[PDB]
Subunit: 355 residues, 4 copies
């Protein structure tokens, strides 16, 4: 009966397409969450518009074009956002909790699980988590990039049944509907390639839908201004574009790796790229061609092919220095080379997420 | 003329020694701060009371004794807490920005300088930064542990002239005013020494760190009228820990905030070299290594007693160090097949004590 | 195109039938009003819940059962109420102005016209008036008594096109729903009469609702003044919009074919400044033939009052048959009571026409 | 031990001299009250600045110069004001109740006692009454006129020990201080007389309030709101601005309500009767009545004027207006024969009259 739904709210929806947060639009979406919340459902908000809110409350000032100017706006803005959410949800006697996070908080299993328990604990006590990127205290490197992908990670953390991306249009279209009249809303997508047939605004949404679906979470893109949208999505009623989740989803045991930020990279053979992508094999040091960055065993890493194309992320069995030394060698050689040995495999397939 | 002050406010100050946040108490401090802000000074708040505000708001709910329970109260509580600070400051037409951080945000130079640039940017546009530990989202390993230490780090990050630790008593006394019936208030201190660490424990660490980065730091009572304004004028108001004559190289102040990635046990001969003569650690003297860590990450250095003598940037990864531990420097390349100089931890990337 | 609607929200609507104000319920109704306000319609709120807001805010204290305990709760609770309204309307970018009144504010034409001009001026500047009884500062004598009757008087003062009474039930049935399964909601009413009051009373069981009795008095007042008035369930989705559109949502008490002269609509709002007991024949004249009261038929006079003031006309049984403007002072009515109109000047020395209360300064029933 | 105080704050004090309400200046004074409230004392607030608040909240709109404009601003503003007081007071965990009144609420003994009982009930339950003139709903004829005079009446209603009129200067000076740097402050004042009325014109309403309140036995003070700890110092009786001293033996409680009544009509009175009223404290006989103005009934409060046109007394009329004209100028034995009825010999008894 009861379900867990992550709702992502873009800046356009929160402002109604303006430079000022629109408390009428927001209160109406809050009402819908309370409606479900009271029915025994578990609601997780992922909010944007912090920087937007910062500009407004600071009266739209002139600030240099630097990382730090965005961060100061987020610091001021995130404060104003959370005040808004806590207040509007208090109309319905619902409490909220502020969680700000980045990829850095999902770099170990242990830190991912810490975030999970918190998020669960809130929901277990009828508190609606309000999630946002920690924009005020984060470098570019450790950031998720956007709240679309963040929401897919929050869905993974929350154990969501559905993920709802509310946005400035009805869903995913075949062509751009603004320029082409023959453009048509796509009702259902059965795997992200089934969608990049026809289908720049929509890029990070498809990435989010890919991640969530692979983790077994249905994901829907719809218009926030659509009346009763959040309820109807809970009931499985067609409402925008439904990205149907993967039938046999990727092992929970390694879904946390979606959220990690790579600690370094490894370039790899054609034969090794083939083995990973064609057969889901483990990476052996045989096929390693170069190793970049300084990283320890247990850290997550990127695996690139020789054209610089990112092919997988995974947990590295050896440190960066050692990889360089066993690179190109057979597994039996490892012990002779390093003086130690942690198995025949540089990255194991059970600690790898492909693509 | 214009000065930057960091003001740390602990839960006892904020609650007034009660259980609920005391908005009458807090607004009087906000007022004092606004007074300095309007005179051109640069105020930074370091707030506690997130978890306190969380239980209050939730109605003192029965929860399991677990880290998640402490983090859920903080999640709710920091929301309640930042809302208080924003509202009370708008009375005096002053804005706040919320900065939540842990040691993990000061593990690189890059990340430490990012926070610094954000903090200063706020101050440049007259916004009062309200800083706190990111309790809601943090494992124990990356937590600073306390806002006394956090405020010292905030001071370094903010290029503060003064750090003000407001507390529930007059300051740092000799023995104790309760126990020994004369035990006076220590007006001034010149370097925290072990005889001074014999006698608040966390407040001394924070003072020590602030003083070594060259920041005058004061422990005073939050309920002393006009305390904040006084401290800014340099008026004797409690206990003043004087800043170190020649402060620690700005070049390496970030290391104060990095969480150690692992630990090294070191010779009695190399313990001497590090502390006495300020020398770089050579593998020669390493006895044991702990944890997975890469080159570039900050680590702990322990004497054979198990005592923390230094924090520094490791030149070699953890596996390397175990292989070159207890060898001469020229042995390195033969042992590893690579080399990153003769030194395990350079004194230029090290902090003593 | 644009209309003026007065919405009356009783305590149970505001609380959702609890002892605590229910902001989810209220904000939902603000939303509906903001919608109308954005579309250029002029909305007036008549709010209850002031005393209830007070108990809630003060933690349900034990207080003596006195007039002053109700008034302290009303002071504390009205402060809270007007906050709530203000804050909620601000979500939709709408301003509210507070107006507290009693019948005393409507005892003159002058003070009635003052209350009117202020209400009109708020509306002309797109401010929503939030009207209540001044329960914190009032004796029982100058009070209206209930906000249903206050809302009728508001609708008059605003020049409202419709009056909407939101309540805790669908609103006025043809029979008791529990006693009769075919009992249906009464859709239309063309004038309130005795028979209807009896239906309304037999439809609620127990010590019949003095409380719906007041809603019918409000509806009579409004209807006579040419204002359609509707009783409906506050918790009905879309109700306020549907009422503005003319959609059948509860019970529609139709305005009077030819309404009572605007000229004297303010008399509804005045608190009588004394009474006059009247003949059998003068009762007939007043009620059956819309005649003026002559001193001839006055049997007894009560209280101290002046010419120009409004007073109650009682029939011999004790029933209040009319309210109207007294042409003479009370002391003068005693001296001319029982005498013909040519004797007035010989009796008093002065004169003010032949009539104790004129039919054009009188509201019957 | 535990006294009752009425702090009156004018628009100037609330706005710090500006056209916006200064919440920093106001929270400072709220705090000074809460300190006494916590100490067992009973605090009443009389607040101006409702129209000030309306103009600000409405974004300073151009409105026609009419009474409906002032009233609409007061409706909007009175809502804004009471939020403020409630919110700022809740910082100190103190509740407020809103009381809005006019002279019409003090025209009977009955309505006056009702007010008093409510104001006493609030205070008894530790609630700070925030009082203002009901500007949104009131014709000019029933308004008090200004919050200074209203605060005196609140002081009477609340049964206060001290009345504090916070304003934007040190207190009452020997002359206007903005026009004179040779004008000293006045520390103490023992009864207001016509000579002092001259020396006060805007400060004119503060003397009227002080007068009313002192005759009711309430010490009243004019001090500067900006002055630090001024509220606390006043409660201690520390000299802080100008202290108007309470009448040694104050006007009967039995008839203090007459101060707050709005005159229903007026009576022009003789030269001799003026003397009998003002010098010898007599009851007004019809003998001395010269002319009567307005319609009024018996039991209503009216104004008595001397042959110049000055207000010499306020009092409860025994006969109605149509009658008082008929019996004016005649002896008392003649009343029943003229009117046909009687109500004693006296037009206005001295036990339902307040002089001056
Ligand atoms: N961190 C951004 C979110 C924008 C997005 O990812 O869509 C903000 O709150 O402004
Ligand atoms: N299959 C090998 C590829 C290297 C090769 O083909 O030699 C690997 O897993 O690395
Ligand atoms: N970070 C803690 C305060 C820790 C301390 O008391 O120093 C909090 O927000 O409650
Ligand atoms: N005046 C009452 C409401 C009376 C009624 O609804 O009839 C109140 O505000 O509590
Ligand atoms: N029609 C008369 C009736 C008086 C009488 O019956 O004597 C009146 O209006 O008073
Ligand atoms: N009643 C006025 C104040 C008048 C005065 O200060 O005397 C107001 O609310 O603005
Ligand atoms: Cl699953
Ligand atoms: Cl819905
Ligand atoms: Cl595992
Ligand atoms: Cl605010
Ligand atoms: Cl320096
Ligand atoms: Cl100070
Ligand atoms: Cl009409
Ligand atoms: Cl609707
Ligand atoms: Cl005199
Ligand atoms: Cl007395
Ligand atoms: Cl003080
Ligand atoms: Mg790294
Ligand atoms: Mg690590
Ligand atoms: Mg029945």
């Amino acid at each position: 009966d009861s379900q867990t739904l992550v709702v992502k709210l873009g800046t356009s929806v929160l402002t109604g397409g303006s430079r000022r947060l629109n408390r009428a639009h927001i209160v109406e979406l809050v009402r819908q969450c309370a409606q479900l919340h009271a029915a025994g459902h578990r609601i997780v908000i992922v909010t944007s518009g912090a920087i937007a809110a910062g500009r407004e409350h600071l009266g739209y000032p002139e600030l240099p074009a630097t990382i730090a100017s965005k961060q100061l706006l987020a610091a001021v803005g995130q404060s104003r956002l959370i005040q808004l959410w806590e207040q509007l949800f208090s109309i319905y006697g619902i409490h909220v909790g502020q969680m700000l996070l980045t990829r850095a908080d999902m770099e170990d299993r242990e830190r991912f699980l810490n975030a999970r328990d918190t998020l669960r604990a809130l929901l277990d006590n009828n508190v609606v988590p309000v999630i946002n990127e920690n924009d005020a205290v984060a470098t570019a490197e450790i950031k998720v990039g956007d709240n679309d992908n963040l929401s897919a990670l929050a869905a993974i953390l929350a154990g969501a049944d559905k993920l709802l991306l509310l946005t400035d249009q009805k869903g995913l279209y075949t062509a751009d509907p603004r320029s082409n009249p023959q453009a048509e809303l796509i009702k259902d997508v059965y795997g992200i390639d089934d969608a990049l047939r026809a289908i720049g605004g929509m890029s990070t949404k498809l990435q989010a839908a890919d991640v969530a679906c692979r983790a077994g979470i249905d994901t829907i893109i719809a218009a926030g201004s659509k009346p009763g949208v959040i309820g109807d999505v809970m009931e499985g009623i067609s409402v925008g574009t439904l990205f149907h989740a993967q039938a046999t989803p990727l092992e929970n045991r390694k879904r946390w790796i979606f959220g990690a930020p790579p600690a370094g990279e490894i370039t790899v053979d054609e034969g090794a790229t083939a083995a990973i992508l064609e057969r889901g094999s483990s990476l052996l040091p045989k096929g390693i061609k170069s190793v970049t960055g300084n990283f320890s065993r247990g850290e997550v890493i990127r695996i690139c092919n020789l054209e610089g194309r990112d092919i997988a992320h995974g947990v590295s069995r050896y440190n960066s220095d050692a990889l360089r030394r066993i690179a190109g060698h057979h597994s039996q050689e490892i012990d002779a080379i390093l003086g130690y040995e942690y198995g025949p495999v540089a990255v194991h397939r059970d600690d790898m997420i492909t693509r």
